Amino acid sequence: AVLALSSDKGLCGGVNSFVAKQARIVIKENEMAGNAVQVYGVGDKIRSALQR
Amino acid sequence: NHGRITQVIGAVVDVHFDEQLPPILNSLEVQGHTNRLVLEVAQHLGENTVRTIAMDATEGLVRGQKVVDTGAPIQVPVGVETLGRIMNVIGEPVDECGPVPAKKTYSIHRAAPLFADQSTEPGLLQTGIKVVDLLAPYAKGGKIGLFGGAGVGKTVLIMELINNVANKHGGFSVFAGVGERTREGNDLYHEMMTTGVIKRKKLEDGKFDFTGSKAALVYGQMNEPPGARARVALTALSVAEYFRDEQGQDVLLFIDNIYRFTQAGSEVSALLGRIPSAVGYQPTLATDLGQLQERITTTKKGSITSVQAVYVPADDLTDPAPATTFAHLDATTVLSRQIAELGIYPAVDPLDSTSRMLAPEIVGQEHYDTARATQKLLQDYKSLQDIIAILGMDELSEEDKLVVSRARKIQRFLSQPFTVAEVFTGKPGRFVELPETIKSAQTILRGECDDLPEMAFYMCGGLEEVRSKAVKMAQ
Numbered sequence: 169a170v171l172a173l174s175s176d177k178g179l180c181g182g183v184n185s186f187v188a189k190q191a192r193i194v195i196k197e198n199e200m201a202g203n204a205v206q207v208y209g210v211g212d213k214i215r216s217a218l219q220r
Numbered sequence: 221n222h223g224r225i226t227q228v229i230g231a232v233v234d235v236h237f238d239e240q241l242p243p244i245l246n247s248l249e250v251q252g253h254t255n256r257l258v259l260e261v262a263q264h265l266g267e268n269t270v271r272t273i274a275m276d277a278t279e280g281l282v283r284g285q286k287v288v289d290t291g292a293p294i295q296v297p298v299g300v301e302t303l304g305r306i307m308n309v310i311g312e313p314v315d316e317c318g319p320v321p322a323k324k325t326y327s328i329h330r331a332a333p334l335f336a337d338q339s340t341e342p343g344l345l346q347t348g349i350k351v352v353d354l355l356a357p358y359a360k361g362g363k364i365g366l367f368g369g370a371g372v373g374k375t376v377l378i379m380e381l382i383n384n385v386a387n388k389h390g391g392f393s394v395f396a397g398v399g400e401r402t403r404e405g406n407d408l409y410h411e412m413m414t415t416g417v418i419k420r421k422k423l424e425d426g427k428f429d430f431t432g433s434k435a436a437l438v439y440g441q442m443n444e445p446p447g448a449r450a451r452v453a454l455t456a457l458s459v460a461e462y463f464r465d466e467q468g469q470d471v472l473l474f475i476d477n478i479y480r481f482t483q484a485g486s487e488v489s490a491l492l493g494r495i496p497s498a499v500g501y502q503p504t505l506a507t508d509l510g511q512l513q514e515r516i517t518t519t520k521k522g523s524i525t526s527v528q529a530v531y532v533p534a535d536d537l538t539d540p541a542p543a544t545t546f547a548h549l550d551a552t553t554v555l556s557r558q559i560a561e562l563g564i565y566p567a568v569d570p571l572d573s574t575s576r577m578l579a580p581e582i583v584g585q586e587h588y589d590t591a592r593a594t595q596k597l598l599q600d601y602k603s604l605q606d607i608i609a610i611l612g613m614d615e616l617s618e619e620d621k622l623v624v625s626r627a628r629k630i631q632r633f634l635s636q637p638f639t640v641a642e643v644f645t646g647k648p649g650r651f652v653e654l655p656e657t658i659k660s661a662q663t664i665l666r667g668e669c670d671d672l673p674e675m676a677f678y679m680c681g682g683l684e685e686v687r688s689k690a691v692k693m694a695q
């Protein structure tokens with residue numbers, strides 16, 4: 169279970185960008201070995217970043 | 221008929237005949253003068269007075285000098301003897317190789333072909349350039365325009381098109397220079413004598429044999445008056461009409477800085493007594509251009525492909541001259557300084573560029589859809605320029621970031637090192653076929669090249685070079 173903390177407003181630089189980058193890295197690393205991943209999040213920015 | 225000079229104002233000459241007047245467009249020779257000064261009639265004014273434009277400088281003329289009417293307009297020789305040879309507006313060769321031993325002469329001024337004697341058949345050209353082969357396909361037997369300011373690569377693009385078309389053409393060709401640098405004129409002459417487009421052989425007794433040439437040359441350059449600059453394109457058009465009317469052949473016609481054809485009028489009408497239009501241009505700015513362009517047309521006898529370079533003063537594309545010229549073209553290519561400052565060459569703006577031979581009934585459906593998808597991508601990237609400049613890419617969503625990435629990648633992929641640029645770029649030239657361009661664009665749009673960097677697409681041609689460059693840059 170990956171808990172990604174983020175914000176709800178924009179103009180925050182690229183902090184949510186780096187967060188979602190690390191989260192993508194972790195997910196793609198842990199889904200190869202076969203570990204079933206779940207995603208919890210805080211803020212709409214991570215949702216918009218990882219939806220598609 | 222004999223006449224007398226009464227008044228001289230720069231490039232304009234007022235003449236007085238006693239018995240009988242000459243009609244308009246007729247040629248007159250000035251007698252009490254060092255060189256062969258020729259005057260072309262333009263107007264009638266009364267009192268048996270005539271207004272004329274001089275094909276050379278008026279320094280030395282006198283009110284009282286004598287003038288002789290030739291009875292016909294200016295006459296330029298025609299035949300296979302003009303091939304492999306330079307010729308000024310009055311037909312006199314300036315190659316310093318002898319005279320032009322041609323049987324027949326044609327008038328500089330001819331009426332255009334009629335409506336019924338036209339043939340609009342859709343063909344394509346193999347330029348070897350990605351941007352035009354993909355997004356602005358050139359029409360075999362049609363007009364093509366290269367619009368640009370100063371220092372964007374019009375002359376370089378024309379030299380590349382010459383290298384990639386005329387050598388691989390077989391038929392004939394013509395090059396007109398209307399206010400271009402004599403340096404590049406000599407350079408073209410020597411590159412043609414190198415590549416065999418011009419085949420000069422020095423017979424004994426100082427004679428010459430240009431047999432084997434496939435390109436004529438007409439040069440009225442910046443060191444010439446307006447009257448000697450506004451009548452060169454007509455000479456070249458006569459030379460090409462001889463080919464595509466009598467010989468029946470398909471010809472090419474490269475023209476450099478057609479804008480001067482208007483500029484001359486703009487620095488002549490004021491002396492001819494005409495009221496200026498918006499920006500000092502003429503009231504005849506549209507008819508004087510259409511009477512030139514309507515002679516350029518494919519017909520049932522032959523074909524003229526045409527490649528015109530159009531200056532854009534002060535980088536303003538809303539000027540009346542280019543505005544009018546846009547309506548007369550079958551294919552277009554607008555170069556930009558904003559894109560040249562990024563080091564992208566050819567600096568073609570693929571959104572201002574357009575064509576009529578892009579429809580799915582001419583080029584295929586995969587070509588059509590790839591071109592339209594590229595245009596959509598570049599417009600979607602244009603629409604984010606403001607918010608990127610103010611805030612930055614971090615504000616954007618992920619779809620928009622992917623769009624920006626692919627748009628920068630396809631911008632850098634739509635750049636090509638030419639062969640004629642090797643002298644000041646060093647890197648060798650890259651001819652690029654169309655199916656290769658289309659596969660590469662398809663892959664870049666799909667997403668099969670997002671893993672690569674952005675500077676791996678710069679000056680690489682196809683994708684194998686891009687991938688090799690990304691490999692070498694990984695180190």
Ligand SMILES: Nc1ncnc2c1ncn2[C@@H]1O[C@H](COP(=O)(O)OP(=O)(O)O)[C@@H](O)[C@H]1O
Nearest residue numbers: 369370371372373374375376565637638641645
């Ligand atoms: N293929 C090219 N690659 C890189 N730079 C180029 C290329 N072609 C032109 N440039 C630049 O374009 C400029 C001249 O272009 P040119 O069309 O001759 O000027 P103009 O439009 O005034 O006639 C030069 O600075 C030249 O270095």
